[PDB]
Paper text:
GBE (also known as 1,4-glucan:1,4-glucan 6-glucanotransferase) transfers α-1,4-linked glucose units from the outer ‘non-reducing’ end of a growing glycogen chain into an α-1,6 position of the same or neighbouring chain, thereby creating glycogen branches.
The hGBE1 active site is a prominent surface groove at the (βα)6-barrel that could bind a linear glucan chain via a number of subsites (left), each binding a single glucose unit. This region, replaced in amylolytic enzymes by sequence insertions and bulkier residues, maps onto a hGBE1 surface that is proximal to the ‘+1, +2 …’ subsites, and to the β4-α4 loop that is disordered in hGBE1 but adopts different conformations in the O. sativa and M. tuberculosis structures (right). Additionally, the tyrosyl hydroxyl group hydrogen bonds with the His289 backbone oxygen (left).
Author numbering: 43 to 365, 384 to 467, 471 to 700
Write the structure that this text describes.
């Protein structure tokens, strides 16, 4: 692991981009010439990279699917270009909405039909097996009417999927998300959206990880304009939008995928077994290839310019790095990060990497990967372990604090989207199990099982929110303890959509108890917006008492007190503080609005006296019931 070496390889390639292309700006604008483009003179210009093709042709509805009437002209470095002259009667060559295909002829004499790697729009019609390549040339392009919101001080991320964002068992639309989902997200106090499964993927049940058309916005949810309007509308509400970028692998589809484009097992990918991911059954990019760099870097630029995303989460980074480190893959990621931050410094990149490779989320100029954040993937593991293997009496407070404070900036979250899937368990299900379906009605007994579940759900989220990282993430539904599970239509359930949805209406039902968890989430994030503890320095933990099961710490001037003891409550409990004066409760999980027992009097003045305790110069006395979390603010006398 040589940091000087990683930077030298990066600096060298970036320098070549400047001398052989026109810099990284021009280099990443390949989408302007590659693919299919109607020119201002009425003609059509086309260009593809296909080094192993014998011939390249364009065909479709516009020429009666004549396969060879439009041959590309062969260029240097495996490229092909085509210009079709304007029609004599000055009508359009390729009408909006019509079908196209690139024809590839092999040295074997085989005739292959392909969708362009640079396609904007692909549609599956009715019950067909394969996707069609639809030429996108609308009457009116969408014009963005709102500017980027100011860079947020801290990220409070709402991880989302457009298709499952309604209560119906169908693929929900971009417009539905825009009209009905966006204002819910804003009201919860989230200032950032992590948009999954946007890059086009033929297999809906892959949850967006199986890419077929890399420049195509998934047609499932609607048209490209409807996606642009979604992002634009989000900006008007003061919310930035991040895209999940999958550049780690590609679907093996060849008819409507990137695989075997030029009839070869090594075009955008590596030749042989090295270019295949056995566990995922997918193809692997040749990041060392100059044209693969152009392709992927132009893709990043594409999502920034055309759809105005505010940044990216690069999925599957761990896979990219380890076939020994893949120095070609890391050099791309550095170039990708360099690209994003050079065009806009306020843009954000997040790395999904479980390996924890050093310096990945530190600056490139220090030999780093250049990522702004990494996911704190150790945190959900900890909550699963505790809930699976340990009775409440046996929870190690010191272990909880170590996991949450162990840190490069990370995005903290309590549970993952993987945990919302079928066969797995959510936090809500770990805590309430079968009583999830019997006692979530306010007309039923408030059993000790439901009570314990509701309280720990709030506490687990809050301590993760306040202690765990420099950013927070929440997967759609979990903010109110969404019941049941998530599943996509597939073979294993006979193409069922019954669990491919989200029951947002559960929070609106006054007769159900999901509103309690939802209310807590909204006030938690609104509190962070006021005090900004996520951007504050790392907390000072004054107490992790194993016997009393109390965790106490200070961050951003606020005082956090957690009582994880399953039965004991404390009436004159001493907690150390940094500041003298009067303290007031600013958040209490025992409030009636959160599904608590309303035991605390919020009008109570807490006074800090000069009395050393737990390494703090001052201390106060508090009443903290079993399974209750408290946040206190120092006010003025």
């Amino acid at each position: 692991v040589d940091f000087q070496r990683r930077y030298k390889q990066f600096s060298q390639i970036l320098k070549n981009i400047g001398e052989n292309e026109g810099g990284i700006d021009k280099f990443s604008r390949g989408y302007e010439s590659f693919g299919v483009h109607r020119c201002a003179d009425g003609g059509l210009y086309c260009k593809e990279w296909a080094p192993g093709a014998e011939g390249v042709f364009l065909t479709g509805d516009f020429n009666g699917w004549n396969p060879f009437s439009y041959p590309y002209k062969k260029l240097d470095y495996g490229k092909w270009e085509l210009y079709i002259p304007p029609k004599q009667n000055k009508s359009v060559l390729v009408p909006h909405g019509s079908k196209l295909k690139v024809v590839i002829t092999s040295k074997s004499g085989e005739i292959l039909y392909r969708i362009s790697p640079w396609a904007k729009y692909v549609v599956r019609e009715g019950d067909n097996v394969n996707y069609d390549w639809i030429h996108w040339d609308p009457e009116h392009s969408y014009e963005f009417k709102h500017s980027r919101p100011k860079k947020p001080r801290s990220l409070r991320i709402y991880e989302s999927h457009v298709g499952i964002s309604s209560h119906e068992g169908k693929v929900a639309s971009y417009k539905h998300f825009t009209c009905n989902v966006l204002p819910r997200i804003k009201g919860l106090g989230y200032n950032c959206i992590q948009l999954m499964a946007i890059m086009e993927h033929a297999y809906y049940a892959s949850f967006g990880y199986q890419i077929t058309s890399f420049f195509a916005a998934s047609s499932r949810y609607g048209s490209p304009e409807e996606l642009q309007e979604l992002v634009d509308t989000a900006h008007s509400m003061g919310i930035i939008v991040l895209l999940d970028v999958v550049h780690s692998h590609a679907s093996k589809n060849s008819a409507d995928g990137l695989n075997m484009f030029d009839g070869t097992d090594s075009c955008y990918f590596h030749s042989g077994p090295r270019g295949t991911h056995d566990l995922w059954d997918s193809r692997l990019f040749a990041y060392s290839s100059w044209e693969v760099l152009r392709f992927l870097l132009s893709n990043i630029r594409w999502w920034l310019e055309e759809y105005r995303f505010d940044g990216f989460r690069f999925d599957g980074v761990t896979s990219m790095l380890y076939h020994q480190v893949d120095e070609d893959a890391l050099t791309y990621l550095m170039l990708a990060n360099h690209l994003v931050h050079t065009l806009c410094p306020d843009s954000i990149t997040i790395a999904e990497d479980v390996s924890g490779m050093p310096a990945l989320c530190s600056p490139i100029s220090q030999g780093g990967g250049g990522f702004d954040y990494r996911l704190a993937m150790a945190i959900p593991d900890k909550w699963i372990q505790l809930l699976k293997e340990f009775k409440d009496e046996d929870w190690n407070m010191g272990d909880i604090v170590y996991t949450l404070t162990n840190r490069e900036k990370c995005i903290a979250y309590a549970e993952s989207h993987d945990q919302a899937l079928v066969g797995d368990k959510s936090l809500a299900f770990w805590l309430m199990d079968a009583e999830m379906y019997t006692n979530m009605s306010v007309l039923t007994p408030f059993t000790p099982v439901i009570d314990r579940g509701i309280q720990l759900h709030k506490m687990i989220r809050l301590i993760t929110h306040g202690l765990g990282g420099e950013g927070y993430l929440n997967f759609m539904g979990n903010e109110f303890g969404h019941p049941e599970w998530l599943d996509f239509p597939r073979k294993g359930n006979n193409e069922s959509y019954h669990y491919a949805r989200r029951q947002f209406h559960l929070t609106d039902d006054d007769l159900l108890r999901y509103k309690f968890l939802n209310n807590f989430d909204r006030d938690m994030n609104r509190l962070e917006e006021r005090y900004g503890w996520l951007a504050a320095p790392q907390a000072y933990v004054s107490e992790k008492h194993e016997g009393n099961k109390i965790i106490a710490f200070e961050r951003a001037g606020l005082l956090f007190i957690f009582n994880f003891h399953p039965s004991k409550s404390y009436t004159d409990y001493r907690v150390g503080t940094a500041l003298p004066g009067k303290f007031k409760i600013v958040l209490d999980s025992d409030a009636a609005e959160y599904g608590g027992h309303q035991r605390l009097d919020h009008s109570t003045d807490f006074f800090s006296e000069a009395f050393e305790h737990n390494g703090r110069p001052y201390s106060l006395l508090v009443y903290i019931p079993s399974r209750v979390a408290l946040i206190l603010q120092n006010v003025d006398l």
